[PDB]
Amino acid sequence: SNNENAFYARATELIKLANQQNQNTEIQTGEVSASFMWALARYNAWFGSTSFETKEQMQAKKQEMMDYYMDRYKEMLDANMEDYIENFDHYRATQK
Amino acid sequence: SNNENAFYARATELIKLANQQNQNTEIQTGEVSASFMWALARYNAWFGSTSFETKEQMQAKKQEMMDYYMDRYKEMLDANMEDYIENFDHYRATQK
Numbered sequence: 001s002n003n004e005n006a007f008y009a010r011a012t013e014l015i016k017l018a019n020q021q022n023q024n025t026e027i028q029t030g031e032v033s034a035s036f037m038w039a040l041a042r043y044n045a046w047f048g049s050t051s052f053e054t055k056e057q058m059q060a061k062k063q064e065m066m067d068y069y070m071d072r073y074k075e076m077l078d079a080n081m082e083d084y085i086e087n088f089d090h091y092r093a094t095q096k
Numbered sequence: 097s098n099n100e101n102a103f104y105a106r107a108t109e110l111i112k113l114a115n116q117q118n119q120n121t122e123i124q125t126g127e128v129s130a131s132f133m134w135a136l137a138r139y140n141a142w143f144g145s146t147s148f149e150t151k152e153q154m155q156a157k158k159q160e161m162m163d164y165y166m167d168r169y170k171e172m173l174d175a176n177m178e179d180y181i182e183n184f185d186h187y188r189a190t191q192k
Contacts (some may be wrong), residue, residue, distance in 0.1 A: 050103035055184030070166035077137035088151035
């Protein structure tokens with residue numbers, strides 16, 4: 001209905017919080033994005049604690065578990081790039 | 097006061113939203129982190145529009161602006177890894 005197969009509705013509330021922080025006039029739009037950035041950096045690293053049993057074997061996997069933290073929202077990120085990229089001419093055509 | 101140099105007091109509200117969705121007992125903590133993942137992807141792709149002048153050049157920079165998304169919350173992510181890692185000897189001791 002509102003979401004097809006993905007958690008669109010829920011993840012949308014995550015961004016909804018960011019909207020409130022960006023409502024401040026003297027704040028940079030880049031401050032809120034970076035806040036979401038740092039927030040994911042903490043929230044997503046939480047799963048390191050379930051990679052291995054000992055911190056010894058866990059620590060060696062830091063780079064391996066993080067390979068799917070950097071890269072793994074990137075294809076979905078690019079999927080939102082085109083919305084502005086291939087539509088540039090359209091938006092460029094609506095500005096008068 | 098609630099943050100030193102970084103937007104700790106702000107980014108924590110972003111995670112705070114995740115806390116509400118994490119209140120759903122039948123859901124895994126991972127379905128919330130994944131939402132934050134997809135959410136950040138959409139939010140970061142916004143900056144693509146202010147990267148270049150034409151979509152021709154802009155589109156060719158997508159992977160370059162999408163180098164500093166993935167590979168940039170990286171260092172701040174591992175910064176959280178070490179925290180839990182070094183304190184494994186601590187957490188393992190406080191729990192049974």
